Amino acid sequence: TNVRIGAFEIDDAELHGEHQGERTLSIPCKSDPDLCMQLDAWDADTSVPAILNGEHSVLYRKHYDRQSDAWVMRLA
């Protein structure tokens, strides 16, 4: 829930459990539109560094969820 990406600190990311051999989290673009815009323009094939509840982690862009207007990111 405590997520930092670059200069952005958000507390409304949704960290999902481990499903299908993968862990993901969703960033709500209606709440965090500046971060989502940066994710849109992010270099392809490049990781997104993140601090997850204090733990430095690596995220990858997985899918833009049109139904919920959220960036779905893959952990690790």
Q: Contact residues for its own copies (CB under 8 A)?
A: 29-30, 33-34, 36-37, 40-42, 44-45, 61, 63-64, 66-69, 71
Least distance in angstroms from the C-beta of 34 to its own copies: 7
- Minimum CB distance to its own copies smaller for 37 or for 53: 37
**Burial code of 46-74, b = ≥16 C-beta within 10 A, e = fewer?**
eebebebeeeebebebeeeeeeeebbbbb
- Minimum CB distance to its own copies smaller for 53 or for 63: 63
* C-alpha closest to that of 63 among 48, 73, 55: 73
- Minimum CB distance to its own copies smaller for 22 or for 53: 22
Decide: 34 and 8 in contact? Cβ < 8 Å: yes
Least distance in angstroms from the C-beta of 54 to its own copies: 27
